[model samples]
Target: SVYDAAAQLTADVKKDLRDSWKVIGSDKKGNGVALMTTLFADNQETIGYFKRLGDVSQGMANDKLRGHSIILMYALQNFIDQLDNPDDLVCVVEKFAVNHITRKISAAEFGKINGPIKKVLASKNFGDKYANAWAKLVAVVQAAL
Candidate 1:
């Protein structure tokens, strides 16, 4: 019963984020987050276990699930920082920028994607600093693009 209720609530949150993303002109990254949220919700137990594990384990789990839409978004953002071949930075950025343009993943959707996660972090009583760090990280990535 709790899981059902949580899932429904989560779905609503996801939809709200989607709509908000559309309103803000973020493109399609919000859709990607929603898709990821669906998968995360479906694998709630596994995700929860990972979430509960130590920070290092959680990080590993997140990486393991990188192909999942939301995680992919996160991974894509990190790739911006971790890209090798220092000479090809511009090319790499251009490639992702073009792909985002083609895929229609706008800024508004990107905001929506992180919104729910922020809310969840807050609700879970995580420190404000951590939450804000994530917000800053997202903002930084967006600004870079």
Candidate 2:
């Protein structure tokens, strides 16, 4: 429910996020590439989680990295689109949570990207309000995870 998933966020903040993602473009792949590349640089261990891709050290240019980045960008797009429908958002996140759990992926591992996300968002000039909105969104996601 909206009361549960994004209870801490205001209507204005939610709207801010929707508009911000629109500015990121119709496809948010660039944002994911920047965030993932930045995150990998800071935390190499996280790279092991994606061995299925063979090797992503080459970064965004790698086919596997680019493919996964687009996937993640799509996921975020789905998430943001459902911000006004928190129950739907929770349903989507729970599906991701279960899959990650199957792979022994924890919220703690995902938390590592927070710094990278902020840096990437900062570069976009998204400002603190948008950053804070993302922070709240992350909290709900982590809770489900």
Candidate 3:
């Protein structure tokens, strides 16, 4: 249920970005998708800010967080599992950083997601350093790429 919720939010934000991408002529691929940048504020806040939105009683909007986390989780897993090629891994990290960090998504927002993520993981009897390590890793990728 949480996974679904996270995935949906990601999709919704990406969709909004795509629309803006089209308007700005940034979607060179004609797919209405643009690389996430610091300029994309609303999409970037899908996690932590989503909760804030929910706190304001916007559960319907909070549904978008599902999509957001799903995409991030997918990308992270793909990078880990397909680590043989440095270039591909680099690309994945770059894309994620562009979408999540340099896009100016607040760390507070991430922590909101991380808090639930950590809780879900613990519920499944899994423990990880995902939030902290991923944060540092994203910072490095954003700086380099």
Candidate 4:
């Protein structure tokens, strides 16, 4: 059933993300920059929101890119770690969403993250199942936001 597929998708994504925590942490800044750079590249208008990123082309080497990426990685790690507890996961995501809202972050902007996230995961050799899971998970986060 569709419902079962959706549940399995979430479970697979949770496991994949959890298992790949080290990969994400290996070059925390680099992965973070990759995600952000991809976002800014895909949408030039979004660049204005990240004044710190300045030139997205510079990517990981950009000094100003470090802090933002690190913070994002940390928040994502926290969320992934809390996957078993849906309530806690939602709480974590809610806090992050509310915090971003103060910066005028909209649902559209948040939705943009899904592409880069899937790209990054694919680069890490994540399979179609995992990608599907990621999409579903991001949808959940987007809806929560």
**Top TM-score prediction, candidate number:** 2
Quantify all predictions' global Cα lDDT against the true fold: 0.42, 0.76, 0.39, 0.71
For all predicted structures, in order, the TM-scores are 0.38, 0.88, 0.40, 0.80
Which runs of model 2 end up more than 4 angstroms from their true locations? 1-3, 25-27
Could you give candidate 2's per-residue lDDT for residues 1-145 as a string of tens digits? 4237566667988887787777664655677778788877889888888888766777667887888888888888888887777677888888877878888878787677778767877887988887777777777777866
Order candidates by lDDT, high to low. Answer: 2, 4, 1, 3
Q: In lDDT terms, which candidate is top?
A: 2
Better of 2 and 3 by TM-score: 2
Better of 1 and 3 by lDDT: 1
Off by over 4 Å in 3: 1-63, 105-117, 128-145
User: Model 1 segments beyond 4 Å from truth?
Assistant: 1-35, 38-67, 70-97
lDDT of 2 at 77: 84
Winner on TM-score (1 vs 3): 3
Error of 2 at 83 (Å): 1.1
- Candidate 2, lDDT over the whole model: 0.76
